[PDB]
Amino acid sequence: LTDNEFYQHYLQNSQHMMWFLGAGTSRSAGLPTASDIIWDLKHRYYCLHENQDYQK
Amino acid sequence: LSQLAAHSTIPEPLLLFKDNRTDTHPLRGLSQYGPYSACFNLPGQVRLAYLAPTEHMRKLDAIVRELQNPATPKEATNYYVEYGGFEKVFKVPLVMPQEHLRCLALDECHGVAANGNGLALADKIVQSMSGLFRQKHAFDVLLVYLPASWKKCFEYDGFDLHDRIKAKVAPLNLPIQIINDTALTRQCRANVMWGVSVALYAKAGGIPWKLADWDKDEAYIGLSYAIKKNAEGQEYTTCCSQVFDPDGTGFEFVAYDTRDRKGNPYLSYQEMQSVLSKSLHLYQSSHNGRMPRKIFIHKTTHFTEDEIQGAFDSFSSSTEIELVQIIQSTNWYGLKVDPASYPVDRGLYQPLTESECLLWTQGSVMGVNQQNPGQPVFKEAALTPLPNPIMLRRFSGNGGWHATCSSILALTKVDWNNNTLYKKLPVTLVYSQVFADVVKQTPEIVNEIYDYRFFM
Amino acid sequence: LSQLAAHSTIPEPLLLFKDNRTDTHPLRGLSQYGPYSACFNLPGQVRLAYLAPTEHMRKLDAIVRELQNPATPKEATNYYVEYGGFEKVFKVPLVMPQEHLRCLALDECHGVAANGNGLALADKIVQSMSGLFRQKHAFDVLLVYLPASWKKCFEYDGFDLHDRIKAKVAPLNLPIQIINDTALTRQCRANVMWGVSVALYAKAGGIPWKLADWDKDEAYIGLSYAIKKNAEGQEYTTCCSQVFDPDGTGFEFVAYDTRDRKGNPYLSYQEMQSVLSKSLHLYQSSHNGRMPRKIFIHKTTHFTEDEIQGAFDSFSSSTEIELVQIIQSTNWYGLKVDPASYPVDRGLYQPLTESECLLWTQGSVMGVNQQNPGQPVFKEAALTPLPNPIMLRRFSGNGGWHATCSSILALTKVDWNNNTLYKKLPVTLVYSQVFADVVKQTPEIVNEIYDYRFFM
DNA sequence: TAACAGCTCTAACAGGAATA
RNA sequence: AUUCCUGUUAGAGCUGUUAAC
Ligand SMILES: [Mg+2]
Ligand SMILES: [Mg+2]
C-alpha cells in the first residue's frame, strides 16, 4: 500500500483510529533510545569496576 | 586455595583497512580490502632503486619481478593467505627502476670485505649510494643487497652492519629495505613476499593497516635499552618511542634517544622528565596542542622511586599516567582446559596480585586460520609448544587491568616489519629496542627524533 | 512619513590580543602587543616545508625570506601598518626548512597539467607529499607552490584545484598554505607579507586574535550552500559552520557537512534538527555539558516553516533561538550627513520593518587610521564608492536588534584568513561557504568536522 | 506541470587597490 | 590560490498568479 493512499484512507476515517507508539517516537523527543540506554549502562558498568574517570 | 582471580579474555583487536573495513587478520584484510592508505592514495605509485654489487644485480630484479607475480604459501599455510602481487593486493603499481636510478656497489667494498672492517664497509656502501643523494625525488625506497660473501662483516663484537648502515642513511632521509641471501633462500615464497611487499609499501609512506577504533587522545610511550660493552665498564643506551594517533586519519610512530653517560638503565629524575617533556611536545605538535588525556609507559625494567616522580612532574593534572613494566621471563605458564586441543587463548589476562597480572600475548586466535576454517591458529607452534605469558607490573595506574591489557594486545599487531599475526611485545617496546641498538652503534643520532619507517 | 526609526551605531568591536589587551585594529595590535594565543605555547615555533617543482623553489625561499624581514606598505597605506618582522611581531621564530624538509613535485605533474586533468594533477600533488609525510612531526605548515604553467587546471567547470587539495590533505592533518604567482607579483609587499604571516601563524598553532566581549554562553551558527551542476539536474550541497568562545581560552571555529541529496538549499525538518543536534552536542562537549543559552543561526536564504519548526523543537525552552537571515544584495544604500566626506560610519543598523533591518557591515571605520589620525577609512574605497549594506530578516527572536547586530559586527572581524580590516559577511557564513565549496568538490568529506585553520 | 512576475543566490570570469 | 568585493555574463532556487491535468 502506497503512503499517499494510506493518508487518504486515514483522512477519510480519522474519527475511529487507535494509535500504537512504542519506543519509536521517543527517539525524536530528545530522550535516549534502547541502544543509548544500553550504552549508558555499559559505560557506568565499565567505569565502576575498572576504575576510570567517568567524565574524562 | 587453588582458586585464582577470574581471568578475562581480551578479544583479538581489529585492524583498519581501506574504506575502514575492519579485520583481525592483517594479510587477509590486505587481500580483501587493501592498504589503509589506499583511500588517501598517499604512496601513489611506488618507485624503488637498487644498490648492490653488479654480480648479484639480477637477483634483485628477480625478487622485484617476483613481487609483481602471485605466490602461494607452502610453509605456515594454516595462516598465510594466497599472495596476489603488488599491483593487485596494494592497489598500487610497482615501478621498474630505470638505469639512471639503478646503482652498483663500488668495487673497493669487495676489497674491504677481506679486511674485516665493518665501519669502512658501511661508509663505502654509503658512498656507493651517494650517487642517489641528488635523485631523491625519483625513487622512494632503496633496496641495498648485502651478499653472503660479506657475512664476515655482517655481525661481530661491537658492530652491527645493518644497524650501522641504517644509522648512516637515516639522517639523509631515504629509506632502505636491506635484502640479504636469507630472503632469497627462504623456501615459502608467499611469506617473504608478504613481508617485503608490506615493508616496501610502508617505507614508501603508506599505511598498510591501522588499529581499528584507536583513541586519538591516548599516547603509548615505550622505553627500552641496549648494551655497549665498553673496555672499562658498560654503557646503557636508553631510547623512547611513541605510537600515538594524531587528529588526522593516519597514525604516528616515532622513536628518539633519552639524552651524557649511563652505567645503569634507570633514568634519573632529570633525564626521565626531559624525555617525557619531549614526548609531550611531540604529542602536542600533532594534535594542535591538546593534552594527552592518558599516557601509557612500557618499560622493560621496574620504575625507580625518583623515576615515577619524574614521569609525574612532566605532565598536568588532567593526564592519566599508567606506568607499566613488562616482564618476558616468568616462572608461570598456562594450560587451557574446558584439556583444550589448542593452547590458551591469546589475550587471556590473569590478575595475580594488586599491581601484577599475567597477559598471554602469545596464544591461539579464533577465525584467523585460512586452511581448515573455524579452527584456532598458534603462530609460534614451530618454536615453542606452549605460549609463554608475559607479566605486567603496574606502578602508577589508578585502576583497571583492561585498559593496559587491551592497549598492549592491540599494540602487538601494528609492526609492519613483522609479517606474522602478532609479536611478543607491543610495537613501542620492540621499536624502542631497535632504536636503542641504532643509537648504541652510532652516537651521533641523539639529537634528532626519527620515524618508524626508517628503522623498520 | 520620511522620518524612519532612530538608528544607533554599534562601536568597533574590540579584539583580545597578547596579555588580554584589546585593540580594534588587528594588524596594529599584532605589531604592538602580539597574538592572543601567544600567551600560551600552542605553536612552539613555526616550522615550514616547501612543495614545488624544482624550477620555482627559488620563489618559495625568496618569499619566506621576505616574511623573515620587515616590509613597508606601498598600497592602501591608509590602513596597513609597517611589518615588524615575523619574530618580532608574532614573538615566535619562523624556521626555514632544511634540505629534507623541502620537497620537489614530480615531473609527471607537468605532463598532467599539459594534459589538462585537474583531478590527476591534485592527486599527483598530494602523492608528492610522502617525503614530508615520513617527517610529518618535523614541520607544522607546508607551503605548496603552483607555477603559472598549471593555470589550465587551476579553475574550470565542475572542478577547483584549491578545494580538491584542501579536502585531500585535511584528513592528513597537515596544514597547507597554497601560494600562487599572484602573491609574488602583487605590487605591494606588506600586503602579501601580512596576509601570509597571519595565515601561517593561524595554521601553525592558532588564534592570531580573538574577539573580546564574547559571552561564553552563546553559540553562533552559519549555514551556506554551493551548487554542483549535474548533467541531469543540480546538487545543492549545504554545510554549517559554528563559532563559540568555550570555557577554555581557545576560541573555537569549526565546520561540518549536513547528513543525502538536496535539490534546494532549504533543509527539511529532519535535516535541520540533525544539524542543530550535532551543533549543540559539539557545544556541550566543549562546555562540559552546559546548555547554550543564546543560539544564532545565520542563513543566506530564508528559513522555511520546516526549518523554524526544527529549530524550535531541537532545543529546550531555556535556550532562546535567534533565527536570522542575511541578505547580501539589496536596493537600499545610505549617505551620511552631519553631507560627510566619507560614507556612513560602519556598523550602523537601521530598523526598516518589524522583522527586517539594514546593517552596514561596510562603511567608514574610526580610530584605525595610521596617517593623519582621526580621518575615517573606507575599506572598500577601491572597489566601491559607497558601502552596500546587508539586510537582516529576523525569522525568530524575542527582542533587541542590538543583540544580533553587535554579534554580527564582531563576527565580521575574526576572519584570520582575511588580510583587510573586516568582512562583508560574518565569519560563520564565509566559512560555511568555503566548506560548501570543499564538500561540493569532494563529496567524501561529510563524515568529519574540521577546524578553521585547515581551510582558511 | 507549463508559463509568467519578483527576490535572492551561486557559477565563471575580469580586475584594481582605500578622498584621489 | 596572501587578501578584499566591485561589476559582467548566465542558470537555478524559492515564493506566487493563472491555465490546466
Ligand atoms: Mg625490515
Ligand atoms: Mg590561505
Side-chain angles (χ1 to χ4, degrees), chain B residues 135-151:
Chain B
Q135 55 221 352
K136 214 172 301 313
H137 47 260
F139 79 113
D140 264 357
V141 183
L142 177 60
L143 262 58
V144 160
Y145 176 97
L146 302 193
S149 61
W150 284 356
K151 196 147 48 103

Side-chain angles (χ1 to χ4, degrees), chain B residues 418-440:
Chain B
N418 155 76
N419 69 333
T420 58
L421 177 54
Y422 52 77
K423 302 181 73 36
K424 178 137 158 219
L425 295 178
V427 289
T428 58
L429 270 199
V430 67
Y431 186 33
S432 44
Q433 168 84 342
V434 163
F435 194 66
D437 290 357
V438 157
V439 168
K440 135 207 172 184

Side-chain angles (χ1 to χ4, degrees), chain C residues 162 166 176-178 199 203 417 455-456:
Chain C
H162 175 266
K166 292 299 219 151
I176 170 179
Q177 167 52 78
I178 285 199
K203 308 187 113 131
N417 185 236
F455 296 92
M456 51 95 77

Side-chain angles (χ1 to χ4, degrees), chain C residues 102-345:
Chain C
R102 159 201 322 243
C103 167
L104 302 150
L106 304 85
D107 205 10
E108 325 170 25
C109 308
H110 294 87
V112 180
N115 198 14
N117 200 352
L119 296 186
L121 209 169
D123 264 306
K124 219 61 56 172
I125 292 199
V126 158
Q127 289 165 353
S128 211
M129 267 144 177
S130 72
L132 303 193
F133 270 124
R134 311 198 220 103
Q135 310 143 74
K136 163 65 200 78
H137 64 81
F139 64 90
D140 292 29
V141 157
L142 166 55
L143 297 210
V144 159
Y145 181 92
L146 304 123
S149 159
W150 300 352
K151 200 79 149 194
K152 286 142 212 162
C153 308
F154 277 7
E155 273 142 312
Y156 72 89
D157 78 19
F159 178 85
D160 175 348
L161 193 73
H162 175 266
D163 305 328
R164 190 39 176 266
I165 292 302
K166 292 299 219 151
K168 281 213 158 254
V169 316
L172 304 171
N173 181 265
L174 71 175
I176 170 179
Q177 167 52 78
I178 285 199
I179 281 183
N180 252 352
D181 41 72
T182 298
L184 338 111
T185 65
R186 177 64 180 86
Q187 244 33 30
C188 153
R189 295 276 80 210
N191 203 272
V192 182
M193 291 315 78
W194 266 116
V196 165
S197 147
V198 81
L200 284 207
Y201 188 84
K203 308 187 113 131
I207 320 191
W209 58 69
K210 183 174 162 292
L211 66 184
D213 190 50
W214 220 232
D215 222 346
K216 314 261 184 199
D217 262 15
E218 337 184 72
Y220 306 78
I221 292 157
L223 273 65
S224 267
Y225 54 110
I227 298 94
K228 171 162 217 52
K229 293 254 188 215
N230 237 338
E232 45 267 357
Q234 319 208 220
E235 184 121 26
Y236 264 80
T237 286
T238 167
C239 328
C240 163
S241 97
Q242 183 162 5
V243 316
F244 45 85
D245 179 342
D247 315 288
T249 167
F251 144 87
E252 266 217 310
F253 194 170
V254 309
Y256 34 90
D257 212 334
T258 281
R259 43 260 250 184
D260 211 78
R261 281 193 66 259
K262 285 304 280 155
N264 52 92
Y266 305 114
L267 304 186
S268 44
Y269 196 57
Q270 163 221 340
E271 310 183 39
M272 151 65 68
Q273 232 174 14
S274 165
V275 155
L276 249 201
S277 100
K278 176 158 32 208
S279 158
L280 73 184
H281 150 67
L282 219 66
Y283 184 94
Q284 261 166 40
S285 100
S286 186
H287 276 71
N288 62 69
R290 171 148 94 264
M291 212 49 165
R293 74 145 284 276
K294 226 165 187 307
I295 293 292
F296 298 72
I297 317 199
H298 313 163
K299 204 182 187 331
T300 44
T301 45
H302 66 96
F303 309 94
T304 42
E305 197 173 38
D306 299 2
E307 282 189 36
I308 306 196
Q309 272 307 141
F312 285 167
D313 299 344
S314 91
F315 293 82
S316 97
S317 40
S318 164
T319 89
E320 159 271 1
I321 311 184
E322 186 94 289
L323 289 171
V324 176
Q325 178 202 3
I326 314 280
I327 297 282
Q328 281 137 69
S329 100
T330 199
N331 269 288
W332 296 65
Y333 82 92
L335 305 88
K336 179 200 200 185
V337 317
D338 317 61
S341 166
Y342 279 92
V344 57
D345 187 27

